[PDB]
From a paper:
Acetyl Coenzyme A Carboxylase (ACC), an important enzyme that catalyzes the first reaction of fatty acid biosynthesis, is biotinylated by biotin acetyl-CoA carboxylase ligase (BirA). The Mtb-BirA molecule is composed of two domains; N-terminal domain 1 comprises of 7 β-strands (β1: 29–32, β2: 55–59, β3: 82–88, β4: 124–126, β5: 131–133, β6: 137–147 and β7: 150–158) and 6 α-helices (α1: 13–20, α2: 39–48, α3: 95–114, α4: 173–176, α5: 183–203, α6: 206–215), while C-terminal domain 2 is a SH3 domain with 5 strands forming an antiparallel β-sheet (β8: 220–227, β9: 231–240, β10: 246–250, β11: 253–257 and β12: 261–264). The two domains are linked together with loop L10 (216–219) that connects helix α6 of domain 1 and β8 strand of domain 2. All the apo BirA crystal structures have revealed the presence of disordered flexible loops, which undergo a conformational transition upon biotin and biotinyl-5′-AMP binding.
Structures of dehydrated (dhMtb-BirA) and hydrated (hMtb-BirA) Mtb-BirA, were determined at 2.69 Å and 2.8 Å, respectively, using crystals grown under similar conditions. The transfer of Mtb-BirA crystals to paraffin and paratone-N oil (cryoprotectants) and subsequent flash freezing resulted in the dehydration of the crystals and significantly reduced their solvent content. The asymmetric unit of dehydrated crystal form containing two molecules is more compact and densely packed with a low solvent content of 28% compared to the hydrated crystal forms. Additionally, the most interesting feature is the appearance of two missing loop regions L4 and L8 and 5 N-terminal residues in subunit A of the dhMtb-BirA. The electron density for loop L8 leaves little doubt as to the position of the atoms and though electron density for loop L4 is not complete, apex of this loop constituting residues R69 and H70 has a well-defined density. The two subunits of dhMtb-BirA have structural differences in their loops and defy the expected two fold symmetry resulting in an asymmetric dimer where, subunit A can be considered a representation of the active ligand bound conformation of BirA and subunit B is more an icon of apo BirA with disordered loops. The maximum deviation of ∼14 Å appears to be in L8 loop, which is adenosine binding loop and may correspond to the conformational shift this loop undergoes upon biotin or biotinyl-5′-AMP binding. Large shift of ∼3.5 Å in the flexible loop L6 as well as in the β8-L11-β9 region is an apparent consequence of crystal dehydration. The ordered loops L4 and L8 in the structure of dehydrated apo BirA form an open, large and spacious biotin-binding pocket. The overall changes in the subunit A of dhMtb-BirA structure appear to mimic those that arise during substrate binding and corroborate well with the established relationship between hydration, mobility and enzyme action.
Residue numbers in the entry: 3 to 266
The structure:
């Protein structure tokens, strides 16, 4: 399995092209490597640091995660990995579930313009995954540390397969030949900033847009919740609380968050 090299993210470019003036991005760093962009930001938080609008990107990550929960093994520059701090305390606590939803929407937005022709099943899997042709293209990890939330984005641009990562998919696989990570990071952050603003405003557009690109709605899934608990039903729609309206044989189950696995 040969593989290596790849272009490096230019921090100086992303900085002066994304930080300050009008943008809601206060600060940006690129590191060669870390365990979890989320964990580190979660830590600046706990150290006193205002991480509102602070962006942190890793070239490589041993195990994407943080406060609670481990991770897995990946490969260097095979993907875009970044975290952003978001002040959430001014928004109704019942609405925080939408953040991870917005983030996944923002990723898909950043990427779609790259594909010449829409592939098979490619959209959003409630509540944390961006899929393309039924593979995991991107993962979204939302974590809370009042008055903050950290949004982690792991996006498979190059590849870095295939055990984490057990059925994911990289842009290359969707026929994008020479994806520029910098251009992508820049768009993704622009999409993110926008979606966040919407979320803060309780824009109804945010939910319609989500439902519009939802692969989960209309189909039949298994929702893996904490432990060996699993629910199988048909997703009808989501509520204003970013929760899944799940139709289990005629009876509705409203699961807040958790893993899903499209069956139908």
């Amino acid at each position: 399995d040969r593989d290596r090299l790849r272009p490096p993210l230019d921090e100086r470019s992303l900085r002066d092209q994304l930080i300050g003036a009008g943008s809601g991005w206060r600060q940006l760093d690129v590191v060669a490597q870390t365990g979890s962009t989320n964990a580190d930001l979660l830590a600046r938080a706990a150290s006193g640091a205002d991480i509102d609008g602070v962006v942190l990107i890793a070239e490589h990550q041993t195990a994407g995660r943080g406060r609670h929960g481990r991770g897995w093994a990946a490969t260097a520059r095979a993907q875009i990995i970044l975290s952003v701090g978001v002040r959430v305390v001014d928004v109704p606590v019942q609405a925080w579930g939408w953040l991870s939803l917005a983030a996944g929407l923002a990723v898909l937005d950043s990427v779609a313009p790259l594909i010449a022709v829409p592939p098979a099943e490619t959209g959003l899997k409630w509540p944390n995954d961006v899929l393309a042709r039924g593979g995991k293209l991107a993962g979204i990890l939302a974590e809370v540390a009042q008055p903050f939330v950290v949004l982690g984005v792991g996006l498979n641009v190059t590849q870095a397969p295939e055990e984490v990562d057990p059925d994911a998919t990289s842009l290359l696989d969707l026929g994008v030949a020479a994806p520029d990570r910098n251009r992508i990071a820049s768009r993704l952050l622009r999409e993110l900033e926008a979606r966040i603003i919407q979320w803060r405003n309780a824009n109804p557009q945010l939910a319609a847009d989500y439902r519009a690109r939802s692969l989960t709605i209309g189909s039949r899934v298994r929702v893996e919740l904490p432990g060996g608990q699993d629910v199988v039903g048909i997703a009808r729609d989501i509520d204003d609380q970013g929760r899944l309206c799940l139709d289990v044989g005629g009876r509705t189950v409203v699961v807040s968050a958790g893993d899903v696995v499209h069956l139908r």
